[PDB]
Amino acid sequence: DADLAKKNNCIACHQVETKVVGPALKDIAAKYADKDDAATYLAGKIKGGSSGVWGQIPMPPNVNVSDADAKALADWILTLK
Ligand code: HEC
């Protein structure tokens, strides 16, 4: 989980409670990934990147990782809650 996202990049700029570049994880999730399938929806926002949805620096096009590894990360978030 942690080492996974960190292994890739999500944790690189998305911590669990604190944030460095953009918003932290517990927040992004409780921000939109706390209702319906926002995980996949937002997953669309992830690949689409963000510019003025939060206020931090604009994140590049990074979905999660690859095919399953990425899907596993997004899930790790829904579970991160
Ligand atoms: C630093 C290079 C980052 C890495 C690595 C990842 N993200 Fe990121 N993310 C970053 C910033 C600076 C921001 C804020 C952009 C802004 O609008 O100011 C974000 C934002 C997100 C969001 C928010 C989507 C939204 O609500 O519109 C998501 C869902 C998100 N980031 C996901 C995400 C994932 C899954 C990452 C690992 C693949 C990941 N980010 C890495 C900066 C960085």
UniProtKB/Swiss-Prot annotation:
Localisation per UniProt entry: Periplasm
Transmembrane segments: none
Binding site for heme c: 10, 13-14, 59
Post-translational modification: Binds 1 heme c group covalently per subunit.
GO molecular function ontology, one term from the record: iron ion binding
Superkingdom per UniProt: Bacteria
GO cellular component: periplasmic space
Keywords on record: Electron transport, Heme, Iron, Metal-binding, Periplasm, Signal, Transport
Main location: periplasm
Nucleotide-binding as UniProt keyword: no
Its job: Monoheme c-type cytochrome. Probable electron donor to membrane cytochrome oxidase and to periplasmic nitrite reductase.
Subunit structure: Monomer.
Name of the featured protein: Cytochrome c-552
Source species: Nitrosomonas europaea (strain ATCC 19718 / CIP 103999 / KCTC 2705 / NBRC 14298)
Native organism taxonomy: Bacteria, Pseudomonadati, Pseudomonadota, Betaproteobacteria, Nitrosomonadales
Gene expressing this chain: cyt
Complete-protein stretch covered: 23 to 103 of 103
